[PDB]
Design a protein around this ligand. Sequence first.
Ligand SMILES: [Ca+2]
Lengths: 83, 97
Amino acid sequence: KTPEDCTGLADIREAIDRIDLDIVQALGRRMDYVKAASVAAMLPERARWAEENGLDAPFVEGLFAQIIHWYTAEQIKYWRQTR
Amino acid sequence: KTPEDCTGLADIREAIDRIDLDIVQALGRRMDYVKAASRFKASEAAIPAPERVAAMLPERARWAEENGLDAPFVEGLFAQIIHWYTAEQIKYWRQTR
Ligand SMILES: [Ca+2]
């Protein structure tokens, strides 16, 4: 259901669980690409997307700095593991 | 293109942009739901239900492990999301109710 058609917290939770799983799945696919490849330029882009989507840019930049650094460190681990 | 079908770094960097934009857009839709949920709360202090959050976190962590990702990191990431959205829900609840 849309946010407007939600009749209670149970409807809300159905939608939020789906969004959050979508996010985790996208993050999983994101790692496959990073592995296949084996911040200052990436964050302004993502801060713009945040604003465009009605979200606080600096919070969303915090989320992406966290992500990008994790995936960078994992790429380094993965490289050593596979060479 | 799939990761295997990618011919160089350019393909991968653009796919990552599209995935990252998908996540932002999903996070934008998530905020709409969180703000709509405020209608179903009798008080600012019931934002959030502590047992809801307590069951949400291991579930996302478990999803992470099932998708090739580190549970502690992804659980921490969702802790931050849920926490910030809680604050945003509270602002919205106060403004409207
Ligand atoms: Ca791009």
